[model samples]
Target: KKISGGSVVEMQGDEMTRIIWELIKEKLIFPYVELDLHSYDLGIENRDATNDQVTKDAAEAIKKHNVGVKCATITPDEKRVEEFKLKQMWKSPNGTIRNILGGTVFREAIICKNIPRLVSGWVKPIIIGCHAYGDQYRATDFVVPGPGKVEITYTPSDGTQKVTYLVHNFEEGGGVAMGMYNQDKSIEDFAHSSFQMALSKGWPLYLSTKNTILKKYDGRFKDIFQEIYDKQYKSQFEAQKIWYEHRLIDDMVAQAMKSEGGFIWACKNYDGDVQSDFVAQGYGSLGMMTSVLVCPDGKTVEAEAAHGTVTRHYRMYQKGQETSTNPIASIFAWTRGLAHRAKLDNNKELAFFANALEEVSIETIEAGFMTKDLAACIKGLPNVQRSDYLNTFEFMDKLGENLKIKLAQAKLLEH
Candidate 1:
């Protein structure tokens, strides 16, 4: 009863994640649903070979098809360049995709009931969306080791005027300087995505910024979000009994900690980076986090794990040692992607299978079967025994086995 004729733009990745991606498909995906995959290998070698056109091609394909699921990719640096012998350091594939897609990335942690959490009061999921296009990630930075003057300049190309803003003047102590910028269009899209996300989840949306201090810069985010909400999304949000509000970043943090978090938080680029990690750890382990990038139109999406490739466990795996790497986030990527496809196609079987797979993974963990990473979360690393958790491959197999049983019990499949 699995659905057919649906497709997803599948961009593969690097290292141990690449291996896990294949197993995820083999065990959880291929047997459950049929998809015409616009597959692109975004591995380091393949990216170098194609001169990184593959990344762009994958983005274009996602734009055309309106769905993409990606494995973790390497943002190459000098050592990675030497290791892979790349032609040149390639830009981040995620950045390229985000630029092409024009959306905000919202990450949520998967909550399992039986899994013990440090924050026992946290019942609802804490959804964090990052305005990923600008801020520190794209900022220009320079160091002043000695006495020097720093200025931020905007040269008008229209022959209007040249504006020079004072940044800093170093007289004695050495310091650093940086300048950051964001586009109104990008902010608008971020607002759309955040509003759409809140509508989808039936939750309130909070836009956090430092408008009290950085009036124009941070206030721009606050004003833009408010304007967008009032103009576009406010009515819909009210109909759903959910509202969009703005809070200073510090005030938001204080309120968020004291209050139960079930709302979608819209953060500027820098805060999103720090807050997502904070929220993920508060829930449990980073392995429980799942990331989804929603387009401004709310039609297209790219699903992925919030965490990167497990290089440390990968090294142990390369040495023929048993590595108990967590695969929940990776598994959720497939389920989330397929679920989105199912929603688009209105395919009940595909949707059921996707839910079942997710349920089975969570059920497997809650039934006292999990990977070492989760075991470390529940029991300390030193206290966790070898039998306490399954090895990486075995954990996938366990889920695969349990998933088949769930499907069979539902009478959705035949022997």
Candidate 2:
């Protein structure tokens, strides 16, 4: 093992993926240099013990350190509460971290040739980013009483006028009422992140918004994006021969349908939540979708698998039944974050190591070596037998075996 590249805020997780994570660190990572992890237990028990302060602490550390590699953790449901017996249902750590960091979460499809895609024409990957700031997520919803008024009140804390917007008057039957908002600063930050990602990828960026309808609300997203692009990113995008454009949400969807899927599409909070799912399913599986949280400045990031903790596999493992959980996204989480770390520190060995890890993992899979999840993607799950793919531990060991050969080749090149 070589020396360190840099430190990272390591957020541990829950369930079967957590078990896989330990195996990964032991097999895939420990062979290389050991990084001093600014470790935080984001596991449900620990989060409950510290009242989720550990999560806040970890986010702050990530801001200071500028890098984090996370494992998928469970956001508790009612059943999870009964299982873990927590004090109360805690907030999602990811939500907390994103709030603290004020960043954009980009869900990118990891492309592999052997795996067939639903969109057969999409040979390339589309990295759809979510503008995850205040919108429907932070909106206030209420059931309007019969013949009542529904409005938004902006009570100024600094002795200014209490600006109120007349949402509607429930002059007839009671209906569902809601109020949502987005600030200029949030939109500006989202614009910056969108442009920054496109620049990084050398791909065109499309901002999708329904400005025609919600001209005041969604228009602000489009306007801020245009304003920011004109002032800060237009020249850079032009220089790179890439461009930034705005499209009506419908037009963008239609265009994406016809396109070969190589560009980055930035969506408003609600659209992002809905559309990213559409994009992920179109690609293949959540197993092949990787997530990266990129800060507005483009320097800080946290990488994780877009999927959740594998509770089913965890249950199987508990019963001593072998399971074949896909670890590709989780492995990519490390490789992606470490690559960023290497670039930041300019550590050649570290960069090579990160690249080699990814190469080996992909090469291993493309060479007819993968877990059952991907094997199912290749052929019909009903027709696929146990012999078709490796079990979870076996798959990890295969990756380790390939990584060693890649590492040895790197050593030879050093001479």
Candidate 3:
């Protein structure tokens, strides 16, 4: 019987992940648990057709429902705009959603015992919470055409005073300059979310910033995190025997390289954007990475695969050719979202089922059932044979079979 409890906001996405999304729900999710799913189609074509209203609606739905599991969607580029004949160059759905939700995106990798990691020392997962707002992602940059002086001015909305800072005097040559800003409110929210994630995982948290330089800009990040830790989260973290600290970005990277991975690293927007990929590749493949946007409140979460729509594999699939696409990360999206739902509803059965599915996924890969990507990770790509890895459908079915056996065994033990 399906364990029914709460509602989950489900955002359908694009391309290959969209296909795998259906397979995951059908094979691994729907069979064991029933959910009141608030479905939203955030597919690229639909976003164009709906003038991107669907993306906004989906974000609002996630806000209302408190849990969302999303598949990878295309953030349309010029090529995608041409391919889809888009009405306009729509902005990233993720950017819009994050703007609405006001959260930090934490990315973590799924570890399989059999898979060889690029960094062999990463025995456990290193979670990265990216402060994905108001830095370079939203910076204003302009070419300095034979520049004389470049200045940045901030005028208070309260009609009090206007402050101007000389950014640079490009008297030597013309170069580019950028102005970026971050809100104290947003930084405080990011701190809360990072602390919440560390608390939940029972892991220490480290906020990395280049505060040695960019004293005001990066120092603000350090100060906010420190204040929040000292005032709000310090006690809770200590109760868990966990701690939160700030580290210089350079020192933090070196520390990360040597440490056994069991800590949450909160990064500035740009650093997170870069280092999350570094951590993902270090663990193994982006195909095995899971991303979750944790809102400051800690109640609302949006889970997703960290990779894109697998366009190359989708092209092969379009031609009716078999593709060995890995679905572990996408499968984890559902499990992670459901686990949050279970936590909120206090449903132990649902939590058990969610954990079971996640275990089955990693176990299936560890048991030598994996897609072409992971097989390539194991054996050289040129040496990998078709027999070594299962196709997309075959792998999904294998997980389904394994999950059924595991659940049946659990039921027998219970009786």
Model 3: how far is 182 from its true place, Å?
2.0
Q: Compared with the true structure, what per-residue lDDT tens digits does model 1 show for residues 174-288?
A: 7888888888999988988888889999999999999889999999888999898999998999899999999989999878776778999998877887888788878888789
Q: Tell me the tens digit of each residue's lDDT in model 2 across 235-283.
A: 9999999999899999998788678888999988778777786787677
**RMSD of every prediction:** 2.9, 2.7, 2.9
| Total backbone clashes of candidate 3, pairs 3 or more residues apart or in separate chains | 0
Residue 201, candidate 2: C-alpha displacement in angstroms = 3.1
lDDT for position 58 in model 2: 92
In order, candidate lDDTs are 0.86, 0.85, 0.89
lDDT: worst 10-residue window of model 1? 113-122
Off by over 4 Å in 2: 136-151, 166-180, 234-242
Candidate 1: which stretches are off by over 4 Å? Answer: 140-151, 155-157, 168-178, 230-243, 412-415
Q: Write the per-residue lDDT of candidate 3 for residues 1-415, one digit (tens) a residue.
A: 3898589999899999999999998888888888898999999999999999999999999999999999899998789889999998787787778778877999988888888888878887899999867777666788998959999998989979999989899878898988878899999889888998899999999999888888988899999899989999899999999998888999999899888899999998788878987898787787888888888887999998878899999999999999988898898899899999999999999999999998998899999999998998899789999999999999999999999999998899744
**Candidates 1 and 3, the one with greater lDDT:** 3
Highest lDDT among the candidates is held by which one?
A: 3
RMSD of 3: 2.9
Inter-residue clash pairs, candidate 1? none
Arranged by lDDT, best first = 3, 1, 2
Candidate 3 Cα misplacement greater than 4 A, ranges? 140-152, 165-179, 199-203, 230-245, 413-415
Clashing pairs for model 3 are none
